[PDB]
């Protein structure tokens, strides 16, 4: 139990006090696997772990043979011993081995081949990985010996994870002998898999569909074993991933999941219901028509008692008007350029809408009534009487901006309260429906389902871009539950975002340091629905901190705050127009001189951002009823804010404005809501050249007051990194599948755009046929995950487009600005553990990289 301690020297004296004591022979065995699980802990070193292995390997076979002939435990113990052979095989990247006479040859080849130059320099990887290949197969007898469950899983997994890193390492080179050994592993992926899983490590199933297309899939391994899956539950979390793939993905291989979906349709019918609708896609050709017709009957297997969905959809449509217009003027115009598509695709985009406008007095919408459209669709029955009856002309693409604008001046008058005349509110339950939300955890768990107990007629509009509309679901289990409305949003990437996010805080559990001081990161449950719509969960008493800044001005310092924003785009926009002629781009490539920039931000960010350093902590005295809980919630304020800069950086930014992650009034805590841009796009993309990793506003550290030394405390970011590196597979294997997979995520992010506006969306797809990375994201992404510092070297390397002016500034700012200020020159582009963070916080408040920036992005 001493080994629990995450410190090191302690387990050294204590091995000695159990190593001496001899009276039992089996005591000394546990002392071995103790000393070697100890060996495993120090293996988090760089060369130290290897050294420990070198020392333990000399004494691992030293007394192991002597102590006992065999044990169920000895065998498992043998498996553990084999485990350290992995610490041997790894690490040497063709480097110069330090001066180790006598010791190296003696154990490099002789201790590696059994159990010179012909086998090492080019082949030591094969010598060592075969000594452990033959050692791991000697962890197969736990499959034949019955026992108490626990030990088999520990090796089952670690067996497999040798082969994932085997296969992706194999995704770099190809030969004939590697392929014969590569034909010995991939059918061994399913065996370590399953084996009556009792503790879910779900990442493995997900990598596997990729394994069925990269080679000729294995029907039998997938047919036999996968029906014996429970040998409860587990049918869930893997929810959406399969249905997409089975219908069209993987051809015939994809079908093996139709025995999956129907070995999982019966139990928990409730969940895929909401998605499988969205997962229609399409079906093609001949041998799949036999199967397309099959799951089309699986569709007939779920429309029963599922006759309630159309009504729900009608209600959402009745609910919004502006979202439809913007999902209309952009989809209509310009997409009729190129080669004209008058096929079935462009005619249905009508039926989604132009049929939702020719039927408000017709049976299409006689079953799903609206009231705003009742007048509007009637005001729209007339204009569509002339605009719709078709056309098929291309010069009128530009003329549709006249009509849209006219109806925009007719769509802003309405949008009023109540809105219980659109019916959907007065939907109720008859004969017990002869409910929203779902549970996706592991384990059986029945009675979990909430039941909808009608709505409340009252509603709330909350103005923000798309103008969403808050909702309180009134519910069965004697409680309520509020929701929000985003019917234009493709809630799918943010879906996996939170999945990857409790992958995150699902690793913050297990580290002694992280757990010690209790440091988790709150997130919620988006619920996507049928691609064209979706809703979102809504906590209480949280708000945008921007309002904690407005109401703290008081009409006094608000007459001094009315113009406070005004101090940027008056005094800062003027300083643009002197840099170059006024416009939208900012002519930021012309923005030159590196000290002039530092002048206007050391001068104007001081004079301005000293007004809200007071105002901030002054919004922090109101929060405080008494002077003792103040040092708890300003405290938890950082407790949260540090877990996000570090976190979002790994994710690919948070890009969240002062209204895009919200603070909670009651207990601080900064759950972040914005998830539009991801990875490098927010800076890699040309339409908006914006660069900064996290956000650290000059008047933020100001809040902490005399927190100038370091920041976030050197505590936050070091517990942070440390938890991120210690287990690779998870965070790693999660993003790697998240990409390359969904068609929306890539090349269709050009389509995810036109969000703010549309002037950005053009000239992207034509200039971005070089945005097909997959292999240059993830590799350079995992070196990010903690394996590399660089930080600066990362961004320049990240952007492909020539940067005559922009690239120099980024390189100049990342290293040059701080390289005469040494925050960026001296940290190596090779490796450093926590150094990269010290500058990471640094390479943000540098007034040089704060100067040339975006307006409204709250850059202070």
| H or E element at residue 469 | strand 469-475
Q: Give CA–CA dist 203/206, Å, rounded.
A: 6
Instruction: Give the C-alpha separation, 579 to 852, whole Å.
Output: 11
- Nearest-5° Cα angle at 822, 816 to 826: 100
Q: How far apart are CA 153 and CA 141, in angstroms?
A: 13
Assign 3-class secondary structure to 687-748.
CCCCCCCCCCCHHHHHHHCCCCCCCCHHHHHHHHHHHHHCCCHHHHHHHHHHCCCCCCCCCC
CB atoms within 10 A of CB 23: 6
Q: CA–CA distance from 393 to each of 337, 458, 499 (Å)?
A: 10, 45, 45
Q: How many residues comprise the chain?
A: 860
Phi-psi region of 530 (alpha: psi -120 to 50; beta: other; left: phi over 0): left
**Residue 385 Cα distances to 358, 406, 574, 834, angstroms:** 9, 16, 49, 67
Where do runs of H (alpha helix) occur along 137-195? Answer: 151-169, 177-182, 189-192
Instruction: Give the bridge partners for 475, in sequence order.
Output: 452
Give the resolution to one decimal, in Å.
4.4
Closest CA to 82 of 22, 36, 14: 36
Contact (Cβ atoms closer than 8 angstroms) between residue 64 and residue 28: no
DSSP annotation of 814: I
Q: Locate breaks in the chain with C to N over 2.5 A; list the residue preceding each.
A: 115, 231, 389, 434
Query: Which pair of structure tokens corresponds to residue 685?
Result: 């993309």
Q: How far is CA 761 from CA 172, 348, 685, 710, 855, in A?
A: 35, 23, 10, 41, 20
> What is the DSSP secondary-structure string of 603-658?
HHHHHHHTHHHHHHHHHHHHS-SSTTTHHHHHHHHHHHHHHHHHHHHHHT-----T
Q: Which two tokens stand for residue 262?
A: 């129907």
Three-class DSSP category at 178: helix
451-483 burial, b at 16+ Cβ within 10 Å, e below that, comes to ebbebeeebeeeeeebebbebebebeeeeebeb
Distance CA 159, CA 191 (A): 10
Tally of CA atoms within 13 A in the half-sphere of 215 that contains its CB: 14
Element (H, E) at 147: none
User: Which token pair is 845?
Assistant: 């408040």
Which approach determined this entry?
cryo-EM
Burial group, residue 436, by CB count within 10 angstroms (0-12, 13-18, 19+): middle
Structure tokens, 154: 């520990």
Distance CA(530)–CA(313), nearest Å, equals 9
Helix (H, G, I), strand (E, B) or coil at 247: helix
User: Roughly how many angstroms between the first and final C-alpha of the chain, as a whole number?
Assistant: 50
Two structure tokens written together for 385: 């009487």
CA distance 593 to 805: 11
Give the span between the Cα atoms of 81 and 98, in whole angstroms: 26
CA distances 445 to 442, 626, 663, 799, 839, Å, are: 9, 43, 33, 48, 47
């Amino acid at each position: 139990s001493a080994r629990k301690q995450n410190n090191f020297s302690l387990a050294m004296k204590l091995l000695k006090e159990l190593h001496k004591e001899s009276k039992t022979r089996d005591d000394w065995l546990v002392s071995w696997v103790q000393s070697y699980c100890r060996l495993s802990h120090c293996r988090s070193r760089s060369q130290g772990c290897s050294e420990q292995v070198l020392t333990v390997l000399k004494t691992v076979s030293l007394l192991d043979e002597n102590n006992v002939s065999s044990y169920l435990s000895k065998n498992i113990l043998a498996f553990r011993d084999q485990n350290i052979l992995l610490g041997t095989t790894y690490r040497i990247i063709a480097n110069a081995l330090s001066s180790e006479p006598a010791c190296l040859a003696e154990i490099e080849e002789d201790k590696a081949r059994r159990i010179v130059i012909a086998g090492l320099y080019q082949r030591a990887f094969q010598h060592l990985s075969e000594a452990v290949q033959a050692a791991e197969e000697e962890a197969q007898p736990p499959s034949w010996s019955c026992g108490p469950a626990a030990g088999v899983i520990d090796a089952y997994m670690t067996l497999a994870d040798f082969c994932d890193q085997q296969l992706r390492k194999e995704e770099e080179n190809a030969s004939v002998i590697d392929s014969a050994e590569l034909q010995a592993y991939p059918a061994l992926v399913v065996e370590k898999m399953l084996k009556a899983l009792k503790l879910n490590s779900n990442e493995a199933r997900l990598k596997f569909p990729r394994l069925l297309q990269i080679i000729e899939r294995y029907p039998e391994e997938t047919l036999s074993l996968m029906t014996k899956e429970i040998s409860c539950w587990q049918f869930i979390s893997w929810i959406s991933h399969m249905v997409a793939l089975l219908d069209k993905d993987q051809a015939v291989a994809v079908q093996h999941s139709v025995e999956e979906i129907t070995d999982n349709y019966p139990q928990a019918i409730v969940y895929p219901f909401i998605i499988s609708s969205e997962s229609y896609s399409f079906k093609d050709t001949s041998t799949g028509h036999k199967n397309k017709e099959f799951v089309a009957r699986i569709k007939s297997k779920l429309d029963q008692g599922g006759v309630i969905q159309d009504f729900i959809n009608a209600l959402d449509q009745l609910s919004n008007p502006e979202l439809l217009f913007k999902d209309w003027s952009n989809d209509v115009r310009a997409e009729l350029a190129k080669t004209p598509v008058n096929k079935k695709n462009i005619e249905k985009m009508y039926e989604r809408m132009y049929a939702a406008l020719g039927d408000p007095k017709a049976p299409g919408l006689g079953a799903f009534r609206r009231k705003f459209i009742q007048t509007f669709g009637k005001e729209f029955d007339k204009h569509f009487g002339k605009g719709g009856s078709r056309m098929k002309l291309s010069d009128f693409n530009d003329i549709t901006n006249m009509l849209l604008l006219k109806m925009n001046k007719d769509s802003k008058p309405p949008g009023n309260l109540k809105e219980c005349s659109p019916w959907m509110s007065d939907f109720k339950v008859e004969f017990l429906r002869n409910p929203g939300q779902y549970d996706g955890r592991g384990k059986p768990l029945p009675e979990y389902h909430v039941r909808i107990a009608g709505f409340d007629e009252r509603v709330t509009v909350m103005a923000s871009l798309r103008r969403p509309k808050r909702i309180i679901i009134r519910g069965h289990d004697e409680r309520e539950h509020p929701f929000l409305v985003k019917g234009g949003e493709d809630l799918r990437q943010d879906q996996r975002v939170e999945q990857l996010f409790q992958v995150m805080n699902g690793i913050l559990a297990q580290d002694s340091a992280c757990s010690q001081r209790a440091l988790q990161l709150r997130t919620y449950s988006v619920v996507p629905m049928t691609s064209r719509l979706g809703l979102i969960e809504w906590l209480e008493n949280t708000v945008t901190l921007k309002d904690l800044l407005l109401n703290t001005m008081s009409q006094e310092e608000k007459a001094a705050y009315l113009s406070d924003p005004r101090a940027p785009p008056c005094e800062y926009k003027d300083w643009l127009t002197k840099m170059s002629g006024k416009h939208d781009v900012g002519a930021y490539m012309l923005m030159y001189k590196g000290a002039n920039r530092t002048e206007t931000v050391t001068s104007f960010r001081k004079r301005e951002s000293k007004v809200p350093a007071d105002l901030l902590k002054r919004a922090f005295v109101r929060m405080s009823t008494s002077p003792e809980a103040f040092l708890a919630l300003r405290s938890h304020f950082a407790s949260s804010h540090a877990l996000i800069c570090i976190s979002h950086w790994i994710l690919g930014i948070g890009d969240r404005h002062l209204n895009n992650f919200m603070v909670a009034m009651e207990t601080g805590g900064v759950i972040g809501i914005d998830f539009g841009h991801a990875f490098g796009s927010a800076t890699q993309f040309l339409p908006v050249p914006e660069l900064m990793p996290f956000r650290l506003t000059r008047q933020f550290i100001n809040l902490m007051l005399p927190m100038k030394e370091t920041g976030l405390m050197y505590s936050i970011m070091v517990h942070a990194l440390r938890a991120f590196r210690s287990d690779p597979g998870l965070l790693t294997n999660t993003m790697d599948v998240f990409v390359k997979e969904p068609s929306f995520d890539w090349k269709n992010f050009e389509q995810k755009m036109l969000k703010k506006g549309g002037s950005w969306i053009q000239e992207i797809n034509v200039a971005e046929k070089n945005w097909y990375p997959r292999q240059k994201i993830c590799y350079a992404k995992r070196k990010l995950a903690g394996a590399n510092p660089a930080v600066i070297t990362c961004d320049e390397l990240l952007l492909g487009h020539e940067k005559a002016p922009a690239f120099r500034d980024y390189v100049a700012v990342a290293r040059g600005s701080k390289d005469h200020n040494i925050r960026a020159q001296e940290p190596e582009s090779g490796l450093s553990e926590e150094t990269q963070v010290k500058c990471l916080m640094d390479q943000a408040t540098d007034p040089n990289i704060l100067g040339r920036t975006w307006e409204g992005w709250e850059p202070w």
